[PDB]
Design an enzyme around this catalytic site. Structure first.
Site, PDB file in Angstrom:
ATOM      1  N   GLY B  33       0.502  -1.582  -0.198  1.00  0.00           N
ATOM      2  CA  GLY B  33      -0.107  -0.271   0.056  1.00  0.00           C
ATOM      3  C   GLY B  33       1.043   1.404   0.374  1.00  0.00           C
ATOM      4  N   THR B  34       0.074   2.106  -0.323  1.00  0.00           N
ATOM      5  CA  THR B  34       0.835   3.877  -0.046  1.00  0.00           C
ATOM      6  C   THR B  34       1.620   3.870   0.985  1.00  0.00           C
ATOM      7  OG1 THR B  34      -1.128   4.816   0.419  1.00  0.00           O
ATOM      8  CG2 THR B  34      -1.265   4.816  -1.824  1.00  0.00           C
ATOM      9  N   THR B  35       2.850   4.596   1.353  1.00  0.00           N
ATOM     10  CA  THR B  35       3.245   4.614   2.223  1.00  0.00           C
ATOM     11  C   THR B  35       2.710   5.685   3.271  1.00  0.00           C
ATOM     12  OG1 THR B  35       4.995   4.609   3.770  1.00  0.00           O
ATOM     13  CG2 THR B  35       5.018   6.495   2.048  1.00  0.00           C
TER      14      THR B  35
END
Lengths: 242, 234, 181, 234, 237, 101, 223, 233, 202, 122
Positions: B33-35
């Site tokens: 996922g997006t950090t």
């Protein structure tokens, strides 16, 4: 890049890549095993015709019932696993009778097929059955809102308004000819002959009054299943015209 | 050993080494996922997200990824979308229920435990799969600021700085330096949080924070001049 | 609503009193050699009699054997008592008269509305239970034969209608209808 | 190859963290016919390309009305669309009886989100294979929601779902700056939508039979234009 | 559904559910092998091109437009006993084959030998039409051009035919191959409506039919009722 | 109101609404499942078992191929009894149906 | 596809339901013949067995009869459920169960048990014969584990069924059905000799199990 | 096709039920003989150890009711549950009809229970087979047996358990329909002796009961020894 | 505890040759105290249907509420088709009849146009029973209204509205619960029309 | 059980209760303590779960009820009305006695197959 077994078909709730639900698709393969059923909608009434498919000569072909009366102006023709059909017909009969009790009005066949499909839909969330219905039925009825109409109810839970539909064994051949032969000005009498003509090609055995029975939906007469004598005459007229 | 063939096809199964691999696989879903990072300040907490813009068709004001579980709690997750939003609503239900009964905002440590039990409850039976999201959440209460990070395994701890997503190793490394360098004010962290996201990285920067002093204990987003200042610092 | 029962040396004589005018009330044939006569509340009493007939018939079909009158009487007693458990008692009075083929002897049983069973030489219920014992007890004898019993019943019925019935007999030949009261 | 072992159900995570069984459900929408949705500040429009089972069969219904103020379109599995649409309609009517409020478009899309995400966490059931495009107009104004079976609801200015929906999406992005400014002109907005869906076509052309159009706004309760009424927009 | 059955664990996927030729699983002898009887009276040189297909692609060759007619059938038999025969069709200068592929009734061994006989007796412009569950999109192929990515491949009868055109006796024949993505066991493959459109309008380029009239005929045969469309006409909105 | 049986058929001269209306619904289902008209004895029996369960002096008349002309009265307490003569605008009942006189 | 009732085979039939039929084919032979006004049922029958406490033809009611083939244990329970329904219908309703009704109910029970993966369907095919109450038209029905019930003029189920269903097909004419008790009995006996107990049911609940069939066997054997 | 009891194999046979029948083949042989004036039940006590309490350890023969008894072959654990159910069911009939339950009805109910366990996925078949011996007015002395499959058959003289085929063959050649209860006893002793795998048929390995005249007498080991020597075994 | 109250008032329905009329007073009452002077006692349910449940208000408002919900469900299931007066009558009967052993104490009336266009008026017994009637009144002063009308009727929609005005004007004169305001709903193929007139305040 | 012939009436025979005499409408006059005592345990259990929900959150009641459903549904013994051994542990009744335990409480409808159908709702 090795060949391995794939189990996207065994399960009923298992999606395959591209989103195909196979168990529903395999259910349609069961319909192709069932006897051919024909239905043509037009003015002056709808007509239904079903191959009886006598397993053996001793079988009481006069008692084979692929057409069942749901309401005095609605008729249903079924093909496939008849054992599963009895569950659907019973529900359809109750809904039609229940609607009259609750509204004092004949159930709209478009609503009736919706109720029936809600039952065949029950293999998932409306669950009551483990597997999808192995029977596809063909509803012919007349309501005084949309006129003489014919509905085809697949086990998948979707119904289509069909001018002319053929289900069961040999449906692919029947449908191809119905596309060649059906037209808006098709009168009831020639539709009955047409249904018998379609049955002639796709029925593997000889066409006879004993192995084929016709039915029709008319406002004055309602749903009536033709006697063996009349079907013999129509078959006699058909081969004379040929 | 990272696959555990034989003991990985079912949940609630212990491998010969004692590991439950289905939970470990759920961790790998988080890592894609997006950090997202969370910084704990002396007076509050800060949240930052690298929302990767997909298309112009999205409504910018309604496309918000830093969820607000409660007026005083901020939540940001990385991993499966269905699980992250499912967990947030369940966490939202718990916060409302606690306020309804005890007439006070739910403490952050108590809120984390309620979520931890729910997340852990899905690692007990084979009919359910572990949530595939690592959720960073925090806020402010009577005891001050709190930052928590629960894993798909249901384990959660208090953190001075948290990070998730694909851009995790870089953000955590820089996040450690920030704590080591300034062992922050709610104002300063917002600039630092923006810096870490840009270092970690088309993407847009979303930031939110909740502090006792500058927001009287409420959770608010970063907008207008403050945002631009954080981008300029980054 | 009068029901009578007389246990003669080789049969059992059951009698019963008859807006809607006809030209077999308060009776049910449980078995070829067993007859059941009931009196009490209309409605609540016939469903019980119908239910008993089904169970006894079900047993006969299942085993292909004729359940003895003693067993039938016991079954009725338990069902009647079981019926009253979860409701207010209802006025019902049942007479079970049957011929035991295995023992080759007639049997008559009386069951009250509370579910108590009595083996009787004779029995009655209703208006017939106030004076008729004064006659049957004086005239009844164990070795009385069928034809004698109906003279007693014809005699008895005569007193009933002075102070004021369809008759059936159970024997080794089975149930039999009679016009000679 | 290795995907076969971990795609059995919606409960097994793959060693790479992928949840295949729900990915296929998203891919099931591509089997459905293309539907296009777009909205201006005051008006929202739905355009759908119906399909027939055979030339002797009526075209399948593809647009539904939940009330006079909002409606939706369908793409994907028919049985799932039947369940979700009527379930949503069961919620439009429920609120009015007990509370007498119109259920807001935003709430309508989110109450359904919880329904889809449960099926992706439990064994036996399967993720829905239907995507929805919900359009409505309430106090706040125009609304267009795209619901994916993975429990992801996104506010959108315009979108397209179904077979070959990429072409329509590209056109909408290229014309986002235009059709948003089409305010107070319901007729022109539909023409933009009909043009948008036209790019997704391969062989079949627009006809009064297959094409269906819906529009709703401040002066327009949810109306469905089908049959001869659609000739002008073609 | 509170729990998943402990006993419900799939059999290992390395083995396929192929039909069992002989009940004697403990046979320790050389198994009997199928024979193929290609009719020798077929005047192959009369046909400039040959088309090899499985039955799922029948709608692409309408009886109504092409004037298809039979020339005979291939016979295959196997003792243990099994016997299968497959008709041969043609239209114009084109020779056509349809094998009636099946996963349950017909073992792949029969398809292998038929591939041997077909190639051993045709070695014309070879056209191979097929399907595969391991290809993301439609693939156009020939002897000197490969479009498949390493992950993808072709199996089943069409693989049997392609094997002989590439390796084995009589290798090197010029052929043009078209495979569309599909799913399901052999003989029950399903094709999406998108594939069917891409399929008729492309094979028409090689076969040379009036594309619009050819497409109009094919869609009716595709969509009205066919094994390839299945439930896709009503299972989807 | 009254009704009686005779060689030529049956003569009839002169909550309850629904129960009769609802009963007309059940006979339709029975007329469908068994594909043959429900007999009078059954119809009276169904009604008798119901008024009992929900403790309505309804009457039933009919003419069937096998049963013939029969009259059944159902008391409000659940008492069911057959009747040659019933007494409590003329109709005549035949196998083809009733006739309005 | 073989190991579940809820799974359709790719060709479109449920194998597990089919496998129940082969269990019937392994059972003892049963036969049934419809006369003009009667129905005849014949069945296929160790040294130390107690023959006085055994009849494969069990009557469901005074006017209905039910033979079966396949697993005996399943049949004994399917018969019991039918018997209860016959009396329950005779109780809730007044008229006795129609022959078509009983077979529909019995088939429903078999069909019902097919609606779950945790239940073994009855491996028994019933051969229901009888007369409708106050009717003189013989009626013979057959039920299967799948739940399909059919009306037959003459049918045989169980061991050696195809061979016996071929003998009946050529010797039995639907346009020339036997019109005497002896004629149908001879056909049933002749049917069984191609590979004895015979039961005859006649209208008005007159069911009798024949004894001394050797006369028919001797007569048929000579011819 | 044998992992569960609810699956029919392609041959239309239930392997799980068949395995249950094979289980009984490894149990101590139980033999029952019906005489003209009574019945005899005998059983081989296979589980033997001189430390085992040979007395007061009835494991094969159980009393369901006055004038009824059962000899058990197979899993003794499974029998106790069915036996207690039979005892309850027998008394319910008496409490209901005030008449001793017929043997046929009792056997029918028990077989139905065993059949149900072969029809449910979560229930395995009862690995036990009974030999019912009892007396009632309808048929007098009658002898039955029942299998895990849930089907019973009447018998004049039947042997169940290990070496049933050998014991059954001996019964056919020697069984005369007009024997007495005594003569049944010698035959019962005789059949077991030639059928047991033991070197000799001692009393501690053997169990007995008899229903005659109506009294049912389960023999204590003291008299079992007396009859054994009386027969010359 | 007594679960049933009372609110007084009266309703009147007339089935004209073509048009239909439903009228009722607006006053709400509890044991001699005027709760309010304008409460709409007559409602329009659409589809040329006007409904009014007199008697216990909480029973009446619920019945119309459920009936209105049923109409909406009928529209969804029947492609938004109009609900016939006869269909509504039986639908209401099931609603009323669905609470027999705890019934509504409301004498409700629905007025409209039957299929052929003639005026239609159905009055429902509190336990559900209904019958088609040319004219009907229910409530407290019902007995004071019907006899007067029957003299003058047994007519357009402007001269019957005169008689109803006088009829209610007469009832309010001698009856205390009769309201201080008259509501009239007129149903024709044109549609539904609401007319209000004032009555005596005390 | 409703009658198969008519799906609107109780099956008087299969429902062995002493005839149709115990009609539905008449099971209304009850002992004052019957209703409260019959479902007393249920009320205490639900009340206990509510407190767990309030304090420990919805997770704890979900875990408690899921365990009980696992035990109940995986336990099918048609020859015993006694509660499962593990059911007592979860309910914490492994060292307690009650009149319901001391007093746990026909030819037609008490067969095993009746419980199999009800267990599976077949």
């Amino acid at each position: 890049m090795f060949l391995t077994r794939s189990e996207y078909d065994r399960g009923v709730s298992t999606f395959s890549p591209e989103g195909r639900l196979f168990q529903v698709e395999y259910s349609l393969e069961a319909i192709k095993l069932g006897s051919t059923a024909i239905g043509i909608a037009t003015k002056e009434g709808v007509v239904l015709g079903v191959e009886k498919r006598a397993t053996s000569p001793l079988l009481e072909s006069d008692s084979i019932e692929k057409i069942v009366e749901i309401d005095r102006h609605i008729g249903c023709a079924m093909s496939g696993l008849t054992a599963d059909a009895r569950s659907m017909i019973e529900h359809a009969r109750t809904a039609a009778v229940t609607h009259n009790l609750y509204y004092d009005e004949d159930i709209n066949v478009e609503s009736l097929t919706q109720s029936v499909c809600d039952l065949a839909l029950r293999f998932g969330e409306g669950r009551l059955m483990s597997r999808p219905f192995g029977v596809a039925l063909l509803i012919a009825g007349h309501d005084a809102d949309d006129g003489y109409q014919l509905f085809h109810a697949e086990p998948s839970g979707t119904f289509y308004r069909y001018n002319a539909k053929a289900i069961g064994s040999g449906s692919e051949g029947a449908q191809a000819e119905l596309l060649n032969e059906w037209h808006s000005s098709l009168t009831l009498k020639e539709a009955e002959l047409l249904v018998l003509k379609i049955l002639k090609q796709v029925m593997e055995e000889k066409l006879d009054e004993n192995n084929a029975q016709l039915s029709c939906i008319t406002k004055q007469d309602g749903f009536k299943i033709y006697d063996n004598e009349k079907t013999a005459e129509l078959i006699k007229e058909l081969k004379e015209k040929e | 050993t990272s696959i555990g063939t034989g003991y990985d096809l079912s949940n609630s199964v212990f491998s010969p080494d004692g590991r439950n691999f289905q939970v470990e696989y759920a961790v790998k879903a988080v890592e894609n996922g997006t950090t997202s990072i969370g910084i704990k300040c002396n007076d509050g907490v800060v949240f930052a997200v690298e929302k990767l813009i997909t298309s112009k068709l999205l409504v910018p004001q309604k496309n918000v990824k830093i969820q607000v579980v409660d007026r005083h709690i901020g939540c940001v997750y990385s991993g499966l979308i269905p699980d992250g939003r499912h967990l947030v609503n369940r966490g939202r239900e718990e916060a409302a229920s606690f306020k309804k009964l005890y007439k006070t905002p739910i403490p952050i440590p108590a809120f984390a435990d309620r979520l931890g039990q729910y997340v852990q409850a899905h690692t007990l039976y084979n009919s359910v799969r572990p949530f595939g999201v690592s959720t960073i959440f925090g806020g402010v209460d009577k005891n001050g600021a709190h930052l928590y990070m629960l894993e798909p395994s249901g384990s959660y701890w208090g953190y001075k700085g948290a990070a998730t997503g694909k851009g995790r190793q870089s953000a955590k490394a820089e996040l450690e330096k920030l704590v080591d360098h300034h062992p922050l004010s709610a104002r300063e962290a917002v600039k630092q949080a923006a810096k870490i996201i840009y270092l970690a990285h088309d993407f847009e920067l979303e930031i939110s924070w909740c502090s006792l002093s500058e927001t009287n204990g409420l959770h608010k987003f970063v907008k207008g001049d403050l945002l631009q200042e954080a981008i300029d610092f980054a | 609503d009068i029901i009578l029962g007389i246990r003669v040396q080789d049969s059992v004589i059951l009698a019963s009193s008859k807006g809607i005018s006809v030209l077999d009330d308060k009776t049910r044939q449980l078995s070829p050699h067993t007859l059941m006569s009931f009196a009490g509340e209309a409605g609540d009493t016939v469903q019980f009699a119908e239910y008993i007939q089904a169970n006894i018939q079900l047993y006969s079909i299942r085993e292909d054997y004729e359940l003895s009158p003693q067993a039938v009487s016991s079954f009725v007693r338990q069902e009647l008592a079981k019926s009253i458990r979860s409701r207010r008692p209802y006025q019902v009075n049942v007479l079970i008269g049957g011929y035991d083929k295995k023992k080759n002897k007639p049997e008559l049983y009386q069951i009250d509305y509370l579910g108590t069973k009595v083996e009787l030489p004779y029995g009655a219920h209703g208006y017939s239970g106030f004076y008729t014992f004064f006659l049957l007890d004086h005239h009844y004898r164990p070795d009385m034969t069928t034809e004698e019993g109906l003279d007693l019943l014809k005699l008895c019925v005569q007193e009933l209608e002075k102070r004021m019935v369809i008759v059936k007999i159970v024997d080794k030949d089975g149930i039999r209808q009679v016009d000679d009261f | 190859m290795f995907r076969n072992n971990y795609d059995g159900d919606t409960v097994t995570f793959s060693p790479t963290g992928r949840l295949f069984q729900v990915e296929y459900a998203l891919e099931a929408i591509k089997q459905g016919s293309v539907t296009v949705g777009l909205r201006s500040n005051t008006h929202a429009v739905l355009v759908a390309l119906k399909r027939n089972a055979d030339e002797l069969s009526s075209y399948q219904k593809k647009i539904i009305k939940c009330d006079e103020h909002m409606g939706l379109s369908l793409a994907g599995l028919a049985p799932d669309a039947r369940v979700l649409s009527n379930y949503l309609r069961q919620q439009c009517n429920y609120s009015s009886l007990v509370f007498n409020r119109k259920l807001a478009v935003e709430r309508a899309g989110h109450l359904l989100c919880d329904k889809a995400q449960k099926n992706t966490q439990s064994y036996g059931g399967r993720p829905y294979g239907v995507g929805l495009l919900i359009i409505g107009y309430d106090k706040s104004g125009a609304h267009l929601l795209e619901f994916q079976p993975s429990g992801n609801v996104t506010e959108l200015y315009g979108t397209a779902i179904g077979a070959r929906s990429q072409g329509a999406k590209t056109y909408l992005e290229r014309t986002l700056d235009t059709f948003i400014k089409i305010d107070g002109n319901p007729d022109e907005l539909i023409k933009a939508g009909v043009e948008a869906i036209s790019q997704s076509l391969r062989d079949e052309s627009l006809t009064v039979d297959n094409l269906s159009i819906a529009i709703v706004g401040k002066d327009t309760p949810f109306t469905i234009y089908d049959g001869e009424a659609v000739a002008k927009y073609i | 559904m509170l729990f998943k059955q402990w006993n419900d664990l799939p059999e290992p996927k390395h083995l396929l559910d192929l039909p069992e030729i002989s009940k004697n699983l403990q046979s320790l002898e050389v198994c009997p092998v199928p024979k193929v009887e290609f009719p020798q009276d077929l005047d192959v040189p009369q046909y400039s091109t040959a088309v090899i297909t499985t039955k799922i692609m029948n709608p692409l060759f309408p009886k109504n437009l092409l004037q298809l007619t039979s020339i005979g059938e291939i016979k295959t038999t196997l003792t243990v006993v099994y016997g299968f025969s497959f008709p041969i069709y043609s239209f114009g200068k084109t020779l056509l084959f349809s094998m009636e592929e099946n996963f349950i009734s017909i073992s792949p061994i029969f398809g292998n030998m038929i591939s041997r006989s077909i190639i051993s007796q045709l070695a014309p412009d070879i056209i191979v039409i097929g399907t595969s569950d391991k290809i993301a999109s439609m693939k156009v192929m020939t002897e000197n051009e490969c479009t498949l990515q390493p992950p993808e491949f072709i199996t089943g009868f069409i693989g049997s035919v392609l094997t002989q055109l590439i390796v084995g006796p009589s290798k090197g024949l010029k052929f043009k191959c078209l495979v569309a993505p599909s799913e399901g066991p052999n003989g029950f493959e399903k094709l999406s409506l998108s594939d069917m459109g891409s399929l008729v309008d492309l094979c028409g380029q090689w076969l040379g039919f009036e594309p619009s009239r050819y497409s109009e005929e094919c869609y009716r045969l595709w969509r009205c009722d066919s094994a390839a469309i299945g439930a896709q006409s009503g299972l989807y909105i | 109101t009254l009704a009686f049986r005779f060689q030529g058929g049956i003569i009839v001269a002169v909550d309850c609404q629904f129960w009769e209306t609802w009963l007309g619904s059940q006979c339709r289902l029975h007329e469908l499942r068994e594909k043959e008209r429900i007999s009078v004895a059954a119809a009276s029996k169904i009604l008798s078992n119901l008024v009992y369960q929900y403790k309505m002096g309804t009457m039933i008349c009919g003419y069937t191929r096998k049963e013939g002309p029969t009259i059944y009265y159902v008391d409000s307490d659940g008492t069911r009894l057959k009747g040659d003569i019933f007494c409590v605008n003329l109709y005549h009942v035949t196998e083809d149906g009733w006739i309005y006189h | 596809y073989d190991r579940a009732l809820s799974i359709f085979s790719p060709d479109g039939h449920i194998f597990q339901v089919e496998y129940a039929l082969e269990a019937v084919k392994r059972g003892t032979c049963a036969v049934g013949v419809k006369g003009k006004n009667c129905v005849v049922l014949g069945c296929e029958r160790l040294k130390l067995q107690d023959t006085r406490i055994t009849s494969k033809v069990s009557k469901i009611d005074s006017h209905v009869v039910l033979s079966f083939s396949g697993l005996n244990a399943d049949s004994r329970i399917l018969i019991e459920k039918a018997r209860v329904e016959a009396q329950s219908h005779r109780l809730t309703l007044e008229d006795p169960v129609t022959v078509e009704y009983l077979t529909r109910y019995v088939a429903g029970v078999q069909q019902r048990y097919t609606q779950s993966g945790g239940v073994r369907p009855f491996g028994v095919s019933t051969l229901i014969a009888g007369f409708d109450p106050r009717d003189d038209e013989p009626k013979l029905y057959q039920t299967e584990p799948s739940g399909i019930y059919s009306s037959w003029s003459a049918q045989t189920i169980g061991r050696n069924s195809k061979t016996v269903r071929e003998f009946l097909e050529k010797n039995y004419d639907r346009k020339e059905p036997p019109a005497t008790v002896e004629e149908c009995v001879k056909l049933t006996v002749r049917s069984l000799l191609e590979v004895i107990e015979i039961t005859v049911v006649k209208p008005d609940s007159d069911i009798v199990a024949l004894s001394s069939e050797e006369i028919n066997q001797y007569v048929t054997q000579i011819e | 096709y044998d992992s569960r009891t609810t699956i029919f194999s392609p041959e239309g046979r239930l392997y799980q039920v068949e395995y249950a029948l094979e289980s009984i083949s490894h149990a101590g042989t139980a033999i029952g003989i019906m005489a003209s004036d009574g019945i005899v039940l005998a059983a081989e006590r296979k589980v033997t150890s001189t430390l085992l309490e040979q007395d007061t350890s009835t494991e094969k023969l159980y009393k369901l009711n006055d004038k009824i008894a059962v000899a058990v072959a197979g899993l003794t654990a499974d029998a106790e549950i069915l036996i207690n159910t039979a005892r309850i069911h027998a008394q319910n009939y008496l409490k209901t009809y005030n008449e001793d339950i017929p043997v046929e009805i009792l056997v029918r109910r028990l077989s139905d229970i065993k059949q149900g366990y072969t029809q449910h996925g979560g229930l395995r078949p009862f690995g036990v087979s009974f030999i019912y011996a009892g007396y009632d007015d309808r048929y007098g002395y009658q002898l039955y047996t029942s299998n895990p499959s849930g089907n019973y058959t009447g018998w004049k003289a039947i042997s169940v358990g290990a070496n049933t085929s050998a014991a059954q063959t001996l019964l056919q050649m020697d069984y005369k329909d007009d024997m007495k209860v005594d003569d049944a006893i010698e035959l019962a002793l005789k059949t077991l002796s030639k059928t047991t795998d033991s070197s000799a048929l001692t009393y501690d390995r053997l169990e007995f009961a008899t229903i005659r005249k109506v009294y049912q007498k389960i023999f204590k080991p003291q008299e079992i020894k007396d009859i054994l020597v009386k027969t010359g075994i | 505890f007594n679960p049933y109250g009372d609110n007084g008032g009266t309703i009147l329905g007339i089935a004209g040759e073509d048009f239909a009329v439903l009228a009722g007073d607006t006053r709400n009452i509890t044991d001699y105290s005027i709760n309010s002077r304008y409460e709409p006692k007559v409602f329009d349910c659409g589809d040329n249907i006007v409904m009014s449940a007199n008697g216990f208000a909480a029973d009446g408002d619920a019945l119309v509420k459920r009936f209105k919900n049923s109409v909406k469900w009928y529209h969804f299931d029947h492609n938004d088709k109009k609900l016939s007066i006869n269909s509504a009558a039986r639908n209401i009967q099931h609603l009323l009849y669905g609470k027999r052993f705890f019934p509504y104490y409301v004498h409700t009336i629905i007025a409209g146009l039957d299929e052929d266009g003639k005026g239609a008026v159905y009055s429902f017994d509190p336990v559900g029973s209904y019958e088609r009637e040319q004219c009907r009144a229910g409530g407290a002063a019902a007995s004071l209204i019907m006899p007067f009308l029957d003299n003058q009727v047994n007519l357009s929609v402007e001269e019957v509205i005169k008689l109803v005005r006088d009829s209610f004007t007469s009832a309010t004169e001698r009856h205390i619960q009769v309201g201080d305001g008259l509501e009239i709903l007129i149903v024709t193929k044109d549609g539904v029309r609401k007319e209000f007139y004032e009555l005596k305040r005390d | 059980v409703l009658s198969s012939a008519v799906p609107s009436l109780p099956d008087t025979l299969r429902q062995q209760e002493g005839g149709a005499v115990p009609l539905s409408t008449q099971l209304n006059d009850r002992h004052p303590l019957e209703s409260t005592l019959k479902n007393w345990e249920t009320t205490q259990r639900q009340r206990q779960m509510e407190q767990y929900r309030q304090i420990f959150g919805i997770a704890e009641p979900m875990k408690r009820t899921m365990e009980m459903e696992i035990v109940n549904r995986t336990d099918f013994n048609p020859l015993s009305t006694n509660g499962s051994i593990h059911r007592d542990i979860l309910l914490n009744k492994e060292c307690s006695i009650d009149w319901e335990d001391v007093y746990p409480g026909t030819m037609v409808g008490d067969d095993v197959h009746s419980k199999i159908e009800k267990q599976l709702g077949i």
